[PDB]
Ligand binder design. Structure first.
Ligand SMILES: [Mg+2]
Lengths: 231, 250, 212, 240, 244, 222, 233, 235
């Protein structure tokens, strides 16, 4: 009300409204799902188009051979944060001949978003990210909020109508975690999960976007007729 | 962090008034009375030592300050603003003059430098004006004795005699009646004490009054002998005893 | 190295050798000493090879930006001065450059600018730069006329490089010919000095000192 | 440094500081530009509220940017000097590097760029100035006349006016200027320029300034008596 | 953050005016009147000190008339402290020009420089403008005797006779009435003092309330002399012209 | 005084075929008269069907190869996983090298692969970035021993057809990958005999449309 | 640019079937003066890596602090700091190699020759060299300074190529290293009798041996040597 | 007042949303992509008959293989064009090749959100970036001041955008020829323009693989307008 003019101002109840408004931009964004087993980690994203002549906005970004994320919210902010990740992944490889741990990647994203919430002049990031990766401690899935909060999860979803997919994964938890050494079945579970967030529209060939990383699987994105198999 | 106040805090109002300068002058008006009188062979500057508490040692608080060996200053208004201005005034007398010309600045030019500092606080980013008016008395070879007033705006005027602060209006009227162009230094001191008594409520003695002069050279205060041209400072702060002696012949 | 360029009735002839040496060691016989800045402008290599390649490729980028902004072909005067002003900023740092910026525009006609890593910029009709420049100058000066044909002008440039290639130890390999017209430059082939020497010797009767 | 975003968008998509800069131009004295077949003429209004002026030394409204290009303006006088200075410097810089004087379009594009920069830079307000830039390109006999404005947009004009009551003189020019046959001579072009100012000026005495620019750096400013002869001839023909 | 307290000194009103410049001009209208009159054989500068006191040391005082170099002087109207900042900058420019070209700075060039500085404060920096208006009286070998004025907007213009400060409307009418082109310095001295005498808010015009100066070629042969009048000399010229 | 440069010896060789390209290099690494390693790989697969070697001062050689490999990675990020063509890689390397014009990478760089028409390609760089497409290029310590041999046996220089006596040149017939490898091996065998810094092992990287293949051969260890 | 002041001489090392051995004497020379006799020049990092340093000691001590600081930093927000995300020899080396080359490129080098010896997560032997120039190389045997000239020849007789590594036991490897240290004591004028030896085995882990001495020395033949040519007495 | 980079309660940047309103006030610009080329067309919209309409430059060349059309506060586009041209040329310098249309568009869009308290406000102009590369063929992009860019088969921006887009919805198919696209731009421009469409108040341009980017002559466009009139009167 009087305490939402900038990010440097706490409300009387101890809230940061600019951060909460940035959080709102994620809810407006298109749905994207993340889930993993012990061998693989999968991103499934519903891409959004402007109209029938337009292309479908890309949702998934590769950060390294073993790491990448899906976005929901302001796409330019995801480009900035993904570019930052790319560098940090790259710094670790060049300097330490070491692949950047997925947990440590989350710590870095958290700290970068935090500085934007405590200083005058700037603004919070207006995007949520789902980071998947496979490192020395197996498969991982992270959920990034522009408040700074990063959370390691078995599965999750962010965007509009994401609650439907999130409840499905909460039921399926015991099943999909056990899908080891079978990428197709893990993607199927991700496609079935994101389907719980759909209304009116359904998953078409240029609508759906899937990415996967695993034990002997580099981070690879599937679009177009490559995802027709899963429709 | 960073000083993000890079804009003026003093601005012209529709009526053409610079609010913060006016309000600074209002703060000066509330301040304790101080005065200056120029004689033919000297200048006197005086003020009341308004002690905030009797437990406080009012000798440690110097309202009358030496700027150069031949220049002194006194104020009315906010003491802390005065203290820093004295520090800056002393340094600027060296950096922008003595280190260049190998001699102390004349009264008018030092006053000009002080004024410039006060003007800048009236226009620069993220600062308020100084809440003081200064009375600067001094002597130099080519201009002789002089007395200057300096206001928060940075404006400065030379005076034969004047007063600032609490009871300035009444004090200036008193000085107009007594002042002439044939006054000796002792006569000006006598008039200064008379004028200052009117604005003082409580105790009136050498311990509650601070008074200094710009007069003859003081070789005893120089600290060394051997150089004929170096004859000592013309600034001298009167002692508590020296004031009380003249209060008997009052 | 031996590079030359001269103005004539039919435009400009540019001719260069192809040799590159590191001390006495012949590093390459197939070096390109003509940079094709763009379809209308040419530049020659002498002194530093990288300095030439880098900054004249860069010059082509600056010329392209000029004609995008001004909707007009850049003048040879302007193109040359961009390069000379650049190297002048680097003066002292140790850039090595001796080049002819060659071009043909409407307002100027055929124009040649000698540009130098010392900051020198000279307009002229005939220029020769390199370790074998003095040998090329001799043939040029004695045979040059404004009213040369394109065929004869091309041969004169070829023959003048051959003269240097023979005598100058640090020149040779092959001869590259260019002919600059208003509609652009035209490449006139790579000519091996080994085969060219014997061909010229026989047909021209020159080099009687040499046994063939 | 002072970084405050003064020029910003409003809910309706307007940048008020740029629009309020145009209002400063509207207040400024009228300026007019008319290009003939082999010349361009720049007319300028001098408000007669200021007498006892020294016209020798008082800043003239039309300014030479180079020997072949001129710039007149309407709006804040102090602001115009900054644009004129930058333009004059850029004109010499262009001659130094390109070895050729600026085209009128290039000089216009530069000034318009400066004006634009001040509409989205921190800690600065836009220029309260619209300009008329006229001249002839090097080795070219085609007349050139361009206009700029605080927002930074610029364009070419057969004839144009800016400043106070510019609506009226533009009305006049729109009916009196023929594109198929522009003012063939210097006389015809100057006459049409004076006529257009006489719709607005008040008295035709010292209130009208005329500057004629011709090809090959041939620029001259008309005197009071020369202009007064045009004023006399126009009104004598009008009495009919 | 800090934005909350920003007055925004460099913005346009809806009408297209610069708020702070307009208010600074209002400030200047309450300042002591300063008049400049240009004649064929010299320039006069006359100015009124604001409600003085009998204890003010007049002979060592200077609030209105300042010397920029040997050829150029200025009369001030507004904040004296602001003027001195600009005056010292102007004095330096004159010396920079003299060092560079080995010739005294032309009057207009100096005026344009100071006026451009004032302009800058109205367009960028977020600071308040200088609450000062100058009358420049000067001479050079190109245009001869020149009178200029500049104000907080950074706009300057040339004049034959001009006033700044208080009652400029009344003063400018009186000057416009009695001024002629073939006028001489001694006549301009009389006009300047007569104008102030009628426009003053004081009961009577006296020597202690005035600063006066003349730039004359009345110096021995082809050269120019600046004369800043002393208190006794202002008293004499007041009797001579018949005002006291 | 500190000398930031050193000489790690070694010798490399690139040869462009008709539809293939080879980039070879010995595996010996040295300082002065001591051997540091008998097997220290010098020719590297940089992805996108490009192979690279930066011979000379190994610290600058390693630094450059690392930065180029990095440039390939970021080219993919910035330009939608587009394949970096050999000619584009060559221009990019020029800027990497010229970037340090006044404190150069003390290396003689060679890359090899296929051009956009599928033909064999070899590019050769100097220490400060001047580069050029070539058919044949030896680099490093024994370059002066190998190049003349290659002029003679690859380009058939000074060779004429019997009977004609200097009138007809030997025709420039195309060499197979098996034929090139023979010439590479004999070049390195000869260089090993007559150059002290050459020996231990030969590693060849062969580039075709099918990908990058490696071959290793022993060399004399004295 | 500087000059080394307090210096450490040869570091020698080699691979064997299950791991690596590294050794270096305990001397800190001050020119020809054998100033400091209790200097440890093998610095272990975790339980899987030993970094052996020669050259300027003040720069060694700086590098020692960087490695100590590296372990601390790796532990921050790292639940697997003593498991999967522990520091590897390859990580430690690459970090040093970066620093060494950066410092030489600023014309202000760390005046050292470093050998990082260790065993990786998968049991692979790690042995690589880096020096003040940022030059790096790997080999079955590695040695700095005089060790390069005298130790390598002896160690290469045991492991002459990659295929000899599985055939070389820890007893044979340690014997060769100890013999090499004796040879360097005979012949390097900037060496000491006292040294340290470290073994990093994939099965038995890190074994760090301090206060070792060169023994079984041959000097008796010296008594028979008389004069410099013709002298008999 | 309030921050420049402030979020609204709905989760949108005020300044970006306001700049989109300025773009709605701008003149109409239409782009149509086909397999034979991409066509760009604009409404010039001269404010007076004395304004020489050929000086109105709302279609602009970035490189030989990339063209650009603008709508909104066109003065703001000049620095965007400059950057685009610099990026296209710089990439050619570094990589000896043409730069991808998407990569160019991405480089331009990176400028968009570089505003705060960098520039003081977002851009008040939208761009239709059309071009061709070997990887993805003929492409048309719409670059906004939000930093977002969408690829389109066809797209209209400016005052008559939603009406024109609805028309493009029906008319566009994957087998359009270049000539068919030219007439279609002219048809829809004529529909949404206030004044009557002719060769002086409207402009056409295209980008083909062979000839590159070309702005159409007023004589060439005039013939296409006459061809349009006849085919509409034909039924
Ligand atoms: Mg050998």
């Amino acid at each position: 009300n009087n305490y939402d003019g900038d990010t440097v101002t706490f409300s009387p109840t101890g809230r940061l409204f600019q951060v909460e408004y940035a959080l709102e931009a994620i809810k407006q964004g298109s749905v994207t799902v993340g889930l993993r087993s012990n061998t693989h980690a999968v991103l499934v994203a519903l891409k959004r188009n402007a109209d029938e002549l337009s292309s479908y906005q890309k949702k998934i970004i590769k950060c390294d051979e073993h790491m990448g994320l899906s976005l929901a919210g302001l796409a330019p902010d995801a480009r900035v944060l993904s570019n930052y990740l790319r560098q940090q992944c790259n710094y670790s490889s060049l300097v330490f001949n070491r692949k950047l741990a997925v947990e440590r990647a989350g710590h870095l994203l958290c700290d970068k978003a935090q500085k934007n919430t405590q200083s005058y002049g700037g603004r919070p990031y207006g995007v949520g990210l789902l980071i998947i990766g496979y490192d020395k401690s197996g498969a991982h899935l992270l959920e990034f909020q522009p408040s700074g909060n990063v959370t390691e999860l078995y599965g999750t979803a962010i965007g509009a109508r994401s609650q439907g997919a999130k409840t499905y994964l909460e039921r399926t938890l015991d099943t999909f975690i056990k899908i080891d050494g079978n990428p197709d079945e893990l993607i199927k579970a991700g496609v079935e999960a994101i389907s719980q967030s759909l209304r009116d529209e359904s998953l078409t060939v240029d609508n759906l976007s899937i990415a996967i990383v695993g034990k002997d699987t580099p981070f690879t994105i599937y679009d177009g007729e490559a995802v027709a198999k899963y429709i | 962090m960073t000083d993000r106040y890079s804009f003026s805090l003093t601005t012209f109002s529709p009526s053409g008034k610079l609010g913060q300068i006016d309000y600074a002058l209002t703060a000066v008006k509330q301040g304790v009375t101080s005065l200056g009188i120029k004689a033919t062979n000297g200048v006197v500057i005086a003020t009341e030592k308004k002690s905030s508490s009797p437990l406080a040692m009012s000798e440690t608080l110097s309202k009358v300050s030496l700027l150069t060996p031949d220049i002194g200053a006194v104020y009315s208004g906010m003491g802390p603003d005065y203290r820093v201005l004295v520090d800056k005034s002393r340094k600027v007398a060296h950096t922008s003059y003595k280190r260049i010309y190998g001699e102390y600045p004349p009264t008018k030019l030092l006053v000009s430098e002080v004024a410039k500092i006060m003007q800048e606080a009236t226009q620069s980013g993220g600062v308020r004006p100084f809440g003081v008016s200064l009375l600067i008395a001094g002597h130099d070879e080519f201009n002789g004795f002089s007395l200057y007033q300096v206001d928060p705006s940075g404006s400065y005027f030379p005076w034969k005699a004047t007063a600032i602060g609490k009871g300035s209006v009444a004090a200036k009227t008193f000085l107009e009646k007594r002042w002439n162009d044939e006054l000796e230094l002792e006569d000006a001191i006598h008039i200064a004490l008379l004028t200052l008594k009117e604005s003082v409520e409580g105790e009136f003695n050498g311990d509650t009054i601070e008074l200094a002069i710009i007069g003859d050279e003081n070789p005893d205060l120089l600290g060394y002998t051997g150089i004929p041209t170096d004859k000592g400072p013309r600034f001298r702060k009167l002692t508590s005893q020296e004031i009380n002696d003249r209060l008997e012949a009052l | 190295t031996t590079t030359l360029a001269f103005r004539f009735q039919g435009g400009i002839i540019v001719a260069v050798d192809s040799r590159a040496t590191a001390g006495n060691w012949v590093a390459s016989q197939t070096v390109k000493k003509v940079i094709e800045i763009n379809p209308f402008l040419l530049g020659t290599m002498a002194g530093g090879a990288a300095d030439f390649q880098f900054w004249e490729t860069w010059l082509g980028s600056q010329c392209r930006l000029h004609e995008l902004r001004e909707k007009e072909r850049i003048s040879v005067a302007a193109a040359s001065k961009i390069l000379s002003n650049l190297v002048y900023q680097y003066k002292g740092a140790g850039l090595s450059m001796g080049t002819m910026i060659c071009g043909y525009t409407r307002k100027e006609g055929p124009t040649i600018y000698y540009v130098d890593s010392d900051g020198t910029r000279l307009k002229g009709d005939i220029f020769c730069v390199g370790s074998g420049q003095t040998f090329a100058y001799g043939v040029l000066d004695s045979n040059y006329k404004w009213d040369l044909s394109v065929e004869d002008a091309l041969y004169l440039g070829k023959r003048s490089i051959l003269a240097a290639a023979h005598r100058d130890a640090y020149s040779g390999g092959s001869v590259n010919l260019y002919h600059v017209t208003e509609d652009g430059w035209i490449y006139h082939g790579n000519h091996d000095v080994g085969e060219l020497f014997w061909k010229v010797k026989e047909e021209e009767g020159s080099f009687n000192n040499v046994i063939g | 440094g002072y970084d405050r975003a003064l020029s910003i968008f409003s809910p309706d998509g307007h940048i008020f500081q740029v629009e309020y800069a145009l209002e400063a131009v509207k207040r400024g004295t009228c300026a007019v530009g008319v290009k003939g077949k082999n010349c361009v003429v720049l007319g300028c209004e001098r408000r007669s509220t200021l007498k006892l002026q020294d016209t020798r030394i008082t800043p003239s409204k039309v300014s030479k940017i180079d020997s072949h290009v001129v710039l007149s303006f309407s709006g804040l006088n102090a602001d115009s000097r900054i644009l004129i200075e930058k333009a004059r410097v850029e004109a010499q810089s262009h001659r130094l590097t390109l070895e050729d004087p600026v085209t009128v379009e290039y000089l216009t594009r530069y000034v318009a760029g400066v004006q634009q920069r001040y509409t989205q830079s921190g800690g600065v307000r836009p220029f309260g100035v619209s300009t008329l830039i006229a001249g002839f390109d090097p080795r070219d006999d085609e007349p050139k006349l361009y206009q700029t404005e605080p927002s930074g947009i610029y364009s070419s004009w057969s004839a144009q006016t800016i400043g106070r009551n510019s609506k009226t003189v533009r009305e006049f020019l729109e009916k009196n200027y023929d594109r198929k046959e522009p003012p063939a001579t210097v006389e015809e072009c100057v006459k049409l320029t004076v006529r257009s100012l006489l719709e607005v000026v008040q008295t035709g005495a010292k209130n009208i300034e005329i500057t004629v620019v011709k090809p090959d750096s041939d620029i001259v400013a008309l005197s009071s008596e020369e202009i007064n002869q045009y004023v006399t001839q126009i009104e004598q023909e009008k009495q009919e | 953050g800090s934005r909350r307290y920003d007055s925004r000194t460099t913005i346009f009103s809806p009408e297209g005016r610069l708020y702070q410049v307009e208010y600074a001009l209002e400030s200047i209208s309450h300042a002591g009147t300063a008049i400049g009159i240009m004649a064929s054989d010299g320039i006069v500068l006359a100015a009124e000190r604001k409600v003085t006191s009998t204890l003010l040391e007049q002979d060592t005082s200077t609030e209105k008339l300042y010397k920029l170099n040997d050829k150029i002087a200025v009369a001030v109207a507004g904040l004296t402290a602001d003027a001195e900042i600009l005056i010292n900058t102007a004095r330096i420019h004159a010396q920079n020009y003299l060092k560079t070209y080995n010739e005294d700075i032309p009057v207009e060039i100096l005026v344009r420089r100071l006026s451009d500085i004032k302009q800058g404060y109205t367009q960028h920096g977020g600071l308040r403008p200088f609450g000062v208006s100058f009358i420049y009286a000067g001479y050079d070998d190109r245009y001869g005797y020149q009178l200029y004025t500049s104000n907080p907007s950074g706009n300057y213009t040339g004049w034959k006779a001009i006033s700044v400060g208080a009652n400029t409307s009344a003063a400018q009418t009186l000057l416009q009435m009695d001024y002629k082109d073939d006028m001489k310095v001694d006549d301009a001295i009389e006009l300047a003092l007569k104008t102030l005498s009628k426009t003053t808010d004081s009961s009577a015009l006296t020597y202690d309330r005035l600063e006066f100066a003349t730039i004359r070629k009345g110096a021995n042969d082809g050269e120019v002399y600046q004369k800043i009048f002393k208190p006794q000399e202002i008293k004499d010229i007041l009797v001579k012209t018949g005002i006291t | 005084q500190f000398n930031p440069y050193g000489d790690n010896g070694g010798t490399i060789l690139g040869i462009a075929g008709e539809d293939f390209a080879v980039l070879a290099g010995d595996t010996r690494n040295i300082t002065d008269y001591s051997i540091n390693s008998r097997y220290e790989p010098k020719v590297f697969d940089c992805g996108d069907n490009i192979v690279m070697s930066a011979n000379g001062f190994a610290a600058d050689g390693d630094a450059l190869v690392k930065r180029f490999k990095n440039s390939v990675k970021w080219y993919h990020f910035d330009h939608n996983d587009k394949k970096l063509s050999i000619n584009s890689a060559a221009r990019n390397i020029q800027h990497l090298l010229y970037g340090k014009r006044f404190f150069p990478y003390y290396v003689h760089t060679i890359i090899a692969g296929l051009d956009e028409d599928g033909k064999g390609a070899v590019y050769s760089f100097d220490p400060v970035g001047s580069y050029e497409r070539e058919q044949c290029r030896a680099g490093g310590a024994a370059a002066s021993l190998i190049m003349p041999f290659l002029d003679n046996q690859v380009n058939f220089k000074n060779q004429y057809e019997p009977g004609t006596n200097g009138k007809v040149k030997k025709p420039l017939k195309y060499l197979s990958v098996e034929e090139v490898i023979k010439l590479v091996r004999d070049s390195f065998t000869s260089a090993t005999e007559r150059h002290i810094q050459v020996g231990d092992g030969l590693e060849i990287l062969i580039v075709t449309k099918d990908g990058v293949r490696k071959e290793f051969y022993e060399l004399k260890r004295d | 640019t500087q000059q080394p002041i307090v210096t450490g001489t040869s570091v020698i090392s080699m691979k064997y079937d299950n791991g690596v051995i590294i050794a270096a004497d305990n001397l800190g020379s001050y020119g020809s003066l054998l100033r400091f006799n209790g200097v440890e020049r093998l610095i272990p990092v975790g339980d899987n890596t030993v970094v052996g340093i020669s050259g300027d000691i003040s720069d060694m001590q700086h590098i020692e602090r960087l490695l100590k600081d590296l372990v601390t930093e790796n532990a921050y927000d790292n639940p697997l700091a003593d498991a999967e995300e522990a520091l590897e020899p390859s990580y430690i080396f690459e970090y040093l190699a970066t620093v060494m080359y950066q410092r030489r490129s600023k014309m202000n080098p760390l005046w050292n020759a470093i050998i990082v010896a260790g065993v990786q997560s998968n049991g692979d032997q790690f042995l690589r060299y880096v020096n003040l120039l940022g030059v790096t190389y790997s080999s079955p045997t590695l040695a700095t300074g005089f060790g390069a000239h005298m130790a390598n020849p002896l160690l290469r007789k045991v492991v002459d190529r990659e295929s000899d590594i599985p055939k070389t036991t820890v007893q044979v490897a340690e014997e060769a290293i100890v013999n090499a240290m004796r040879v360097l004591y005979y012949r390097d004028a900037r060496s000491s009798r006292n040294f340290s030896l470290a073994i990093i085995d994939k099965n038995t882990g890190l074994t760090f041996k301090k206060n070792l001495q060169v023994e079984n020395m041959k000097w008796d033949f010296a008594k028979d040597i008389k004069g410099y040519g013709t002298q008999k007495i | 007042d309030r921050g420049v980079s402030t979020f609204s309660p709905e989760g949108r940047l005020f300044q970006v949303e306001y700049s989109l309103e300025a773009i709605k006030l701008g003149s109409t610009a239409i782009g149509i992509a086909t397999k034979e080329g991409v066509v760009l067309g604009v409404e010039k919209r001269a404010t007076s008959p004395l304004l020489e309409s050929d000086s109105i430059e709302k279609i602009v060349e970035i490189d030989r293989h990339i063209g650009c059309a603008m709508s909104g506060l066109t003065a703001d586009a000049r620095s965007m064009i400059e950057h685009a041209r610099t990026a296209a040329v710089t990439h050619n310098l570094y990589y000896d090749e043409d730069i991808n249309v998407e990569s160019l568009t991405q480089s331009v869009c990176d400028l968009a959100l570089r505003f705060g308290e960098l520039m003081s406000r977002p851009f008040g102009v939208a761009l239709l970036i059309a071009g061709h590369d070997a990887d993805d063929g003929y492409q048309l992009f719409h670059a906004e001041p939000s930093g977002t860019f969408y690829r389109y088969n066809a797209k209209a921006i400016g005052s008559g955008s939603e009406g024109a887009q609805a028309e493009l919805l029906n008319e566009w198919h994957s087998s359009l020829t270049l000539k068919e696209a030219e007439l279609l731009v002219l048809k829809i421009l004529k529909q949404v323009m206030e004044e009557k469409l002719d060769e002086n108040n409207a402009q056409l341009s295209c980008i083909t693989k062979q000839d590159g980017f070309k702005i159409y002559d007023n004589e060439k466009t005039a013939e296409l307008i006459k061809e349009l009139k006849e085919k509409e009167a034909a039924e």
